[PDB]
Symmetry: D4
Subunit: 180 residues, 8 copies
Amino acid sequence: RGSHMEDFVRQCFNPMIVELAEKAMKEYGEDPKIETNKFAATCTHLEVCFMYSDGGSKHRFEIIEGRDRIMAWTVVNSICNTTGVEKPKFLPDLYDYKENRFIEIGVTRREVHIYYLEKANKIKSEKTHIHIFSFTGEEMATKADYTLDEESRARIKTRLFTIRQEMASRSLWDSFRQSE
Amino acid sequence: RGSHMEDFVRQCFNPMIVELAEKAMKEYGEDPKIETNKFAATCTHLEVCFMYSDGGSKHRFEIIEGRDRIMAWTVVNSICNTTGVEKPKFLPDLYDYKENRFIEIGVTRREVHIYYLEKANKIKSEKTHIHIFSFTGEEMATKADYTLDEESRARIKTRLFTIRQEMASRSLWDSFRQSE
Amino acid sequence: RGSHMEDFVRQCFNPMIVELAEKAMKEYGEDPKIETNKFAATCTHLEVCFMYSDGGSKHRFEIIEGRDRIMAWTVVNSICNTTGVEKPKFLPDLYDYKENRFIEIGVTRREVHIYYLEKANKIKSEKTHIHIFSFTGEEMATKADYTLDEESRARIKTRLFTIRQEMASRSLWDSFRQSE
Amino acid sequence: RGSHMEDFVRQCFNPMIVELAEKAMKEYGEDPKIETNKFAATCTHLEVCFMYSDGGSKHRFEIIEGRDRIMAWTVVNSICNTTGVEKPKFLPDLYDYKENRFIEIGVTRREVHIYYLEKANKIKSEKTHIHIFSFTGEEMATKADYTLDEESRARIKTRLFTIRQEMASRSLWDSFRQSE
Amino acid sequence: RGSHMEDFVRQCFNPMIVELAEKAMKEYGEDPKIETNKFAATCTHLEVCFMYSDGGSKHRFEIIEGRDRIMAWTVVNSICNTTGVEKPKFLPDLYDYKENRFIEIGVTRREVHIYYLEKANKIKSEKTHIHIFSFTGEEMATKADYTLDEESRARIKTRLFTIRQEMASRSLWDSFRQSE
Amino acid sequence: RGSHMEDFVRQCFNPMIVELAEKAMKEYGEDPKIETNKFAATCTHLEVCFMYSDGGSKHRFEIIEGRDRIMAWTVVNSICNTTGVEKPKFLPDLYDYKENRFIEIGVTRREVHIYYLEKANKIKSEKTHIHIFSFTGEEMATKADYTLDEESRARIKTRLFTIRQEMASRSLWDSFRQSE
Amino acid sequence: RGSHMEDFVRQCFNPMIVELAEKAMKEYGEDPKIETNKFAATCTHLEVCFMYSDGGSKHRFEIIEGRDRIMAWTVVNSICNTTGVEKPKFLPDLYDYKENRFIEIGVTRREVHIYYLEKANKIKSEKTHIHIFSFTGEEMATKADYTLDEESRARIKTRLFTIRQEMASRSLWDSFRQSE
Amino acid sequence: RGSHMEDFVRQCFNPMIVELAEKAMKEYGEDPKIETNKFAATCTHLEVCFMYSDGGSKHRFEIIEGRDRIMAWTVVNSICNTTGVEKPKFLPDLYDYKENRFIEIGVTRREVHIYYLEKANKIKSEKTHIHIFSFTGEEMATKADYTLDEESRARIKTRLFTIRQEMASRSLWDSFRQSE
Ligand SMILES: COc1cc(CCNC(=O)c2nc(-c3ccccc3C)[nH]c(=O)c2O)ccn1
Ligand SMILES: COc1cc(CCNC(=O)c2nc(-c3ccccc3C)[nH]c(=O)c2O)ccn1
Ligand SMILES: COc1cc(CCNC(=O)c2nc(-c3ccccc3C)[nH]c(=O)c2O)ccn1
Ligand SMILES: COc1cc(CCNC(=O)c2nc(-c3ccccc3C)[nH]c(=O)c2O)ccn1
Ligand SMILES: COc1cc(CCNC(=O)c2nc(-c3ccccc3C)[nH]c(=O)c2O)ccn1
Ligand SMILES: COc1cc(CCNC(=O)c2nc(-c3ccccc3C)[nH]c(=O)c2O)ccn1
Ligand SMILES: COc1cc(CCNC(=O)c2nc(-c3ccccc3C)[nH]c(=O)c2O)ccn1
Ligand SMILES: [Mn+2]
Ligand SMILES: [Mn+2]
Ligand SMILES: [Mn+2]
Ligand SMILES: [Mn+2]
Ligand SMILES: [Mn+2]
Ligand SMILES: [Mn+2]
Ligand SMILES: [Mn+2]
Ligand SMILES: [Mn+2]
Ligand SMILES: [Mn+2]
Ligand SMILES: [Mn+2]
Ligand SMILES: [Mn+2]
Ligand SMILES: [Mn+2]
Ligand SMILES: [Mn+2]
Ligand SMILES: [Mn+2]
Ligand SMILES: [Mn+2]
Ligand SMILES: [Mn+2]
């Protein structure tokens, strides 16, 4: 193709982040060359997931997002068959060894309330914790339990607003927002 | 030879883990090419030992497993001739500088109670702590003192069930279980 | 799945070779988890292509195989729009800056004559050079022009027979041969 | 040119520190080849800023100094548009995610009181924290809040006096002091 | 700013190539953020210069392009004060230790004849060799002496047409061509 | 020369440790080729000093031992001219930013009481803390303040007894002990 | 044990050379801790083999020595089943793709004539080339064909005499010579 | 001390070159802190020696300069006891495996004829080849045999004039010239 959004994603995100999002999109029958707005969303969600696991202790989180579908489900089985928690119907993003629960991370262009309502409606397993982030600096989590400390969460929303600024600087933000 | 279990071990475990287990098996007159089930057990026990030492402080544990027999006994002498603890009759796996005791790590395909009974019957030195892990997610330790925190131990049993799943996925688990 | 052939490919070939073949198979709607015999063939063909380019001078060959379909065709256009050679109907493997021609590399489980007859029948552009290799140590090329020197070609067929031996050692060769 | 101060800066400071100060000076129309005293000051201020961020937690500080003017202001916007703090009129050096305030770092050849009076007079945003260091081992901060612990701050002033000694050892200190 | 050409240059060229062109443009009072077409030209000329020196022997060429103005002229003085050749009025790109002459490399969007006529009219030192390349695959040199072998020069023009294709793929070529 | 002790030191200690001890011995007019027993002592003292600084926080200790005489005294001046402590008459080994005092580390083949009595008699500055270690597992410090935690100190004496065992294993210990 | 020869081997030879010789000795039921003279011989023979392959072209030699017995024989089969040469009764050291023959390398403490007579008497396959080196600087090869150029062979014998000097410097040469 | 020449040497020459010259000067009872002009000469001579060996084939030269006195003489013995050449009375710089002779490299601030006359008068072994270089771009060798090709020698004299320019740029050349 040859879009400005594609070259911005390869320049804005880490090379391994781009490669992991490309594998995830291709595994689900999607083309980052054409679905460039979704390409920027998968990369952003991947970085937020990895920054989220970077907060806390060394053995606190088990990263589920970023693996291929078969191996990601294999880790979920080992976590469920060990701690005893229920098997989630959908693939979560992380697991908290400190709180004994799975975490579903969400990044939002609209309001954090709307996505969470849709994310909580999909996830029938009420035990799975949910944590939403927005490109404007807002956040919301299940039972007001934000898991990480304030500084690690603040670094996540700061990076989110930087991506939003770099997008609007080259005029890709308007098409990116009205696309979720 | 040319077994499926051998190629799985080289693919499932870290290269240095495979090399250390090969040296340990050859030092005791064993061939990983033929004793492929024991090859997978030594690798699993080595990774659990190294993950165990990864939990805690930086100078907490002194790793005994993984060294050759002569040097491993040399470290044991230095630890005994310094802290004043008794010399164990058999080579332990680690030493706890925080609890002032040696640790014997065990990985189990049957029940954790049976191995511990055999491990405690062999080790005459009652001061040496014993910690058993199973491929189903169970654990048991001397005086209910599990040494590490809950998160580090949970990561160990999660990896153990992942190895069990990958084994049964290629149909090596049945021969691996009925072989201990 | 969980096949012996898959674990052998990850153990026999270089990690980047495995990753490049996985991307090529997925790009064309193929699964290395199920098409394990084709997985071993794409890896073997990729290594032969890279060993082929390793022979000769530093700027002699332009590697076409291993790139994604869009970029690989982009290089072909630049080579054709510069030297003046005809655009091949199908994607070749390399280009010879010394002989001013594209090269189509083939690896064969049957006879080198049969594949070349099929490879020459497909490639309508008669200018594209063709070079076939077999797992038994045979080779054949267009106009008896084998491009590289004898030592580099001998190293290719030696590696091919080593892959054949390691396959039959674990009893994957019979299914691999009767599958082309 | 060919000054002794220039060769001392390249020998005393880290290569990346020298490169970052050269880019900052050139971006503001300054030549490190001629403004060698200012070259040593920008390098010293850069190292102090980086040593300052090295103290504390992992996600405590967001480094603003060292970036180009456009990107540095982009981070400031993301920090302000997220936490809700006021936009500073001038570019600060760091941001404290623990104390929710920007930090202006200063290095001084005269008295710490004089610079702070000038630094506080320039910065109209009273919320921005100010922390001054001197080449004699003195320090002063807003509301006597020195942010970091005593050991990290002591390491900063120790390095400052080492730079002062190495300068006077080669007789560049007198020209460096009477130049601020 | 936020241009598509800028993000393409950072994605198309090597990171060090981008950094060297940014330093060269800033040293001569130019902004790669605004002069994005000239930014792509300096990067292309830098890569061609480095690919040119990559052809031949190990000690054949002395790279002049890529250094800052003062050091680049220092090398020219050492080359002139040693071999005895005349000092060029303008900074050349390379020096040939095999042919005992400086080389001026040119990359062209129009015809190779027009630039060479302007390049030869500027360079009064007739001893300095001139070698022009075009984005269409053409080349021309002084006295028909193309210095390098055919394969190394062909690799240069092939890369030039690839840059032209990637530019027109994202629709930056038309503005890039009508800008020289 | 060609001594067994020399080859043991290069094999027992880290390469950089050997290089730092060689520079220290040569700076004071000593030859590690002939003073092989002193060569093993300087290496042992250097490793203990570096293991000592490895215990505690990140910015707790400033390493003085291992630097050349001029730079080591330069750091001492910066530490004294900043914290305000007295200048020691002799070069110490470390400085404690947490306890605000210099540390003199000693390694002993005889009794820890004898060296400390000689070390305390030499060091007139009573503020400088003193910490002695022995090859048998004993330790003693000023005012019974052992600075580090128990685990870090235990790791030091364990390494000391390992060096003693490896020395007696090759029969260099007897000459090493009766040489202090 | 604790021998001077052992510590000299670990200090004189490359770490990977020592590890490869240890694996080869253990595979054949030998202990480098006790067979220290044979330990120095296997290391010397391994380095000579690797220096030998370093001479010539890039794809000239296929290294057989250094591999485990099963894989080394696998390469020999691939070389024989491709070029058509006869299978040697004993494991050779290298294969010459330029001369189409296997090479048996020998290192000698006595006279080069005596070993070659024993090496040629053992190797029944007269096609396998034989090349002997001595610690005094002598060499002899089959049909006076020394394969490599003079400079590469001279570097081999120079290293051999350096090992002999370092051995006699520490007084291990006399026991090493009267041990072959 | 604190001289401009010292900081220039650490900035002009490669770090390992500086370390090797410091060891050589200290081994012969010289201080680079005070003998700064000799410090720049040993570094220059070391780089010329290493650039000289960089010219030619891979196994052509054996580097003698840069080693400590004992090991350097050990290599000379191995070279003499192998090729059969005479033992030089003084330590040479290199040995030519292609020409079978030792090489004495010289760098000169005066005329190349004067040094060679002194270098040839000292070296009684007439077989040792002599090659002189000057800071003005001149060279002279025994029997007009300049060993290397023209391009490698030209790169040496070009670097020599660059060092001369950087010295006079900071005004250290006049003291450096009138000091040989
Ligand atoms: C669209 O198919 C896929 C599937 C995967 C694997 C698992 N995916 C997730 O787990 C996940 N996906 C999204 C997301 C992103 C873009 C558009 C729509 C959604 C719902 N957002 C999340 O927060 C999240 O956790 C990866 C990528 N694309
Ligand atoms: C099956 O679709 C693909 C397509 C590609 C991209 C381009 N492919 C080739 O260029 C190529 N493909 C084969 C091959 C391998 C397995 C089965 C059948 C064939 C014909 N053999 C070659 O020699 C060769 O050059 C890569 C992988 N799979
Ligand atoms: C002179 O223009 C510049 C501008 C920048 C970008 C932002 N600069 C700062 O933020 C900053 N500048 C100084 C400083 C240093 C030398 C002379 C005068 C001053 C006031 N001191 C600080 O403490 C500080 O934070 C970088 C370098 N030079
Ligand atoms: C515009 O000022 C500069 C100056 C330098 C330093 C030296 N420059 C060259 O040597 C050089 N410059 C060009 C070029 C590029 C863009 C627009 C116009 C020209 C004439 N083309 C060349 O071929 C070439 O060798 C680097 C970058 N920009
Ligand atoms: C003998 O001259 C030197 C001098 C230095 C520089 C500073 N030295 C120390 O600081 C230091 N020296 C010893 C030590 C070691 C061997 C024999 C006698 C002594 C007293 N022991 C320590 O504990 C210690 O701190 C380094 C090496 N050798
Ligand atoms: C003693 O068993 C072994 C066997 C191997 C595997 C293959 N070995 C060789 O190929 C080989 N062995 C020697 C050698 C060395 C010491 C003592 C006696 C001999 C004959 N010399 C060679 O030249 C040579 O090629 C490796 C090591 N030890
Ligand atoms: C002054 O003592 C030393 C000794 C060595 C070891 C061997 N030295 C040489 O081989 C050598 N020395 C010089 C040189 C340099 C400065 C002043 C006088 C001379 C004659 N010039 C050479 O060309 C050369 O080969 C290294 C350094 N300094
Ligand atoms: Mn997800
Ligand atoms: Mn999610
Ligand atoms: Mn054990
Ligand atoms: Mn155990
Ligand atoms: Mn192909
Ligand atoms: Mn093909
Ligand atoms: Mn600032
Ligand atoms: Mn500041
Ligand atoms: Mn130019
Ligand atoms: Mn040019
Ligand atoms: Mn000391
Ligand atoms: Mn001490
Ligand atoms: Mn052999
Ligand atoms: Mn042999
Ligand atoms: Mn010399
Ligand atoms: Mn010389």
